[PDB]
Design a protein around this ligand. Structure first.
Ligand SMILES: Nc1ncnc2c1ncn2[C@@H]1O[C@H](COP(=O)(O)OP(=O)(O)O)[C@@H](O)[C@H]1O
Ligand SMILES: Nc1ncnc2c1ncn2[C@@H]1O[C@H](COP(=O)(O)OP(=O)(O)O)[C@@H](O)[C@H]1O
Lengths: 460, 454, 48, 44, 49
């Protein structure tokens, strides 16, 4: 029926060339078409953003804050309309979709106050007729590549902050649910944003490779899967770009022998089987006793083509010597006696799957978690104070829960030195965003003197 | 010919195996011998540091501050002795060597106050019987590889801050002037530093490859030449380590047509023959021809260098003054080897360009340095240059206190010559990891002896 | 400008940084505009 | 109206001295732009 | 300590490409005429400041 347009240079462009379809499970009846863009259609966006940058960079902080504040209002105005568009192409409870947007709006609210923490200092005559000052400037034109889960919040976690800092933005969202993202872009233009400051270009590997290649774009921001993340990180960084990359991972819970089992089981059941949760896919048990006990409690409660991916995953698991304790064929699946050499540990799988890994010491458990592409959340379940202190000291995961789950609904590993947390307190991890989208400068200035200033010393 | 010892595990070790000679550059005469260490001798240091870490990590902030404060005093006590040791093996003005150490001491003074900015928050009952807190922890065992220029300050820019944050340190200094560095290490032990917290291991590519390979070392910090920097950056990062790398580069001055030439020439003459500048980008031919006219008169005061110059002529640059020093090249282009390859010695290259945009793009598109200047009378030009150039420190008609040019690799970026209070937090972030803890001790209904262990 | 009963606003129009700096230093008027006019709709001199 | 106290607390009446020996200045500045910055747009 | 209380403010882009600042400047050449009582303190009350 309908076709979705690009949002380059402040107007909606219709591309006809390559094209895929947006489906809508549970129906899988294809609802719209999406344009897979060529390098020419991207260069349009790049040129648009490059053009908008100098004006926007010099826009007063308070005016940028102003346009963001109206953007926040226009989102809180059109909530119903947006959430509908999320649930329709991504397929998720409207209550979840609304909770996502509430988060996106928190991101917009944080961005409105970024101009304040960005003012710098001035000193007249730091030396004889020499002024000095320090500034925090935007870097230029930047791009963000967004995933399927969260078409609302992940972009609103990138571009509002980047634009508040005075950059311009090219957003290449997911092909699979791009309508909700584009609506929110348009509302930003409706709030007052100049043309070219935010551009939305639909596409896929071609479109992304375009942005990775373009020498005008100075920073690249990505959240999605680990292979694509490694790609964009390495290939971006090799071309002098700043790259921020979150790639899918697995969060681990540790169970000590003294763990309060009902407490751990409650967390694991909420995390693995029960976006309003924690993500945990591996339970590292210290000692066999606690593992046997955990399994005893888990099993009862787990009774509450495209398919071929999961069957393949499970089948490999059995083949390599894991104990398939509950076979969910998709329902809840439980694997025991899992080792890090197995494919079921290394490969991430869609769906309700928990793996139990048996280990002999806490040191071994911590080394297991630390030695892989560690996630953004981890728990330890224990009554021992010394164990908990040690775990918090030596684990390398940034957020830790002791007998309590964490508000981290998807697991991501963060690449490189430009590190940003997706689910942390915005006020705590916001400065990392600000630093990614800005460059510090220190200027020293002198205007060398003339002896006389007759008209002959100037130009016509 | 005496022999210089390693400082592993709190005591001085004598290595005899592979071994090179430290010369006295102004006497041309070898004075001492230095031990090129094997992987075993390094693993000693690594094990020593790995052992010291848990105790040191839990040392109180105020006690760490205390040992650093005495370290600062013991350096200000032994200045004469130290500086002598720098001028002797590096060969430099005692006044310069003393000014270097004064900077190193500023770095130590900054580190003493790092424990204060590292305190975090606590909240009882953020949720029902759930406490929350946030902390800045050290990362573990870290290593630093330091260059020939600055054997005092570059190490004191790395390890005091890293140790103040609660890490332990393996320092692999330059083979060519390692005595001054080692003395300062010892004074730190004399100030009160526990054994193993700072270790000094002398060596070469072997020693460095050891640290790049060692999986216990969590961060790697390097200042030196660009090929070695790229090496350590890529090979370090590929093994999950944090890598901070400054590699030698070229600082550029831009001359607009309206530039006050005597002012620019003064900066260039101080910088090339203070500040490091090796390229003068001239916008328009007039200012370039004029600059050359003024430079030539004033430029009258290894086998590497002849090769460098010869290549330049070969690829079509105009050799205006041949210092065989004091060498001046005109009509240089970014495709030439004399632009791409950095050379020791008094060599300036003029690059002619047609617009300011082109000059800024030239500077930005290469491995840009840590300082740059623009010479002009135009306010709009200067504003634009300051806005769009990507170099961190900028001088408008004035040179900057940036005596060596470096490019910074990756995302773990630190400035070597900036205001310590301004760029110090970047150091702190490189040597720490942020943690957010949420905690609950789930309750029991009764606490009879039967509910606990024997 | 300085030698008369000077007002409450003045401008200089120029591209030269040194000229502008000098003007701002040596002019005696309290508000100064460099290539920009000032929100001072009537001119007044202040006594005493 | 240029009043100073000779015998008051210096920290209390000092600002009056400072104001007598200074003038406030308020600068607003813009460098109007050019479309291009080729050498032809500057001088000799 | 008078130099400390005399620093002023800077603001980049108070309007589009328009910076603004405020300073406290000296007025120029000034003169002081002193009395018989207090040949030490009255001048030191004028010229140092
Ligand atoms: N080979 C590839 N190289 C680079 N980008 C790709 C490639 N394949 C897909 N992409 C892009 O990467 C983005 C997200 O990657 P993906 O891991 O598929 O996210 P999701 O979790 O939404 O499936 C998408 O927007 C898509 O266009
Ligand atoms: N080929 C190499 N690979 C790894 N490290 C090296 C190599 N060569 C030298 N180093 C170490 O790097 C440091 C400085 O690098 P270098 O570029 O050699 O600077 P310098 O100008 O001091 O020689 C020295 O401490 C040295 O031990």
């Amino acid at each position: 029926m309908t076709l979705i347009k690009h949002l380059i240079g402040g107007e909606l462009i219709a591309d006809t060339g390559r094209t895929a379809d947006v489906f809508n499970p549970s129906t899988g009846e294809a609802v719209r078409k999406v344009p897979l863009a060529d390098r020419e259609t991207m260069q349009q966006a790049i040129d648009a953003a490059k053009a908008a940058f100098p004006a926007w960079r010099n826009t007063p902080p308070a005016k940028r804050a102003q346009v963001l504040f109206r953007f926040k209002q226009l989102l809180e105005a059109n909530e119903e309309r947006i959430v509908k568009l999320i649930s329709e192409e991504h397929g998720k409870t409207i209550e979840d979709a609304a909770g996502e947007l509430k988060r996106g709006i928190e991101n917009v609210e944080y961005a409105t106050a970024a101009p304040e923490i960005l003012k710098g200092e001035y000193s007249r005559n730091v030396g004889p007729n020499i002024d000095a000052w320090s500034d925090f400037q935007p870097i230029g034109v930047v791009a963000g590549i967004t995933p399927f889960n969260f078409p609302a919040m992940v972009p609103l976690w990138m571009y509002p902050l980047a634009i508040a800092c005075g950059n311009t933005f090219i957003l290449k969202p997911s092909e699979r649910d791009p309508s909700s993202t584009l609506l929110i872009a348009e509302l930003f233009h409706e709030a007052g944003l100049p043309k070219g400051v935010l551009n939305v270009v639909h596409g896929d590997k071609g479109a992304v490779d375009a942005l990775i290649e373009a020498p005008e774009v100075k920073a690249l921001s990505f959240v999605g899967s680990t292979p694509i993340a490694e790609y964009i990180y390495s290939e971006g960084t090799k071309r002098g770009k700043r790259v921020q990359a979150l790639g899918g991972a697995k969060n681990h819970a540790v169970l000590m022998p003294d763990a309060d089992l009902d407490n751990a089981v409650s967390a694991l059941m909420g995390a693995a089987y029960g976006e309003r949760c924690m993500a945990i896919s591996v339970a590292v048990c210290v000692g066999d006793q606690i593992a046997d006990a955990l399994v005893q409690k888990l099993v009862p409660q787990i009774k509450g083509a495209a398919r071929d991916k999961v069957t393949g995953y499970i089948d490999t698991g059995v083949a390599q010597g894991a104990e398939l304790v509950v076979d969910g064929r998709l329902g809840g699946t439980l694997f025991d006696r899992v080792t890090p050499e197995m494919t079921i540990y290394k490969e991430e799988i869609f769906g309700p799957v928990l793996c139990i890994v048996r280990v002999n010491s806490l040191e071994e458990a911590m080394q297991l978690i630390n030695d892989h592409e560690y996630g953004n959340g981890t728990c330890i379940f224990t009554r021992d104070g010394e164990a908990a202190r040690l775990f918090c000291d030596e684990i390398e995961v940034g957020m830790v829960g002791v007998n309590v789950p964490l508000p981290v609904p998807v697991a991501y590993h963060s690449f490189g030195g430009w590190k940003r947390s997706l689910f942390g307190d915005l006020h705590a991890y916001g400065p990392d965003g600000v630093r990614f989208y800005t460059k510090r400068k220190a200027i020293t200035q002198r205007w060398p003197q003339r002896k006389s200033h007759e008209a002959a010393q100037f130009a016509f």
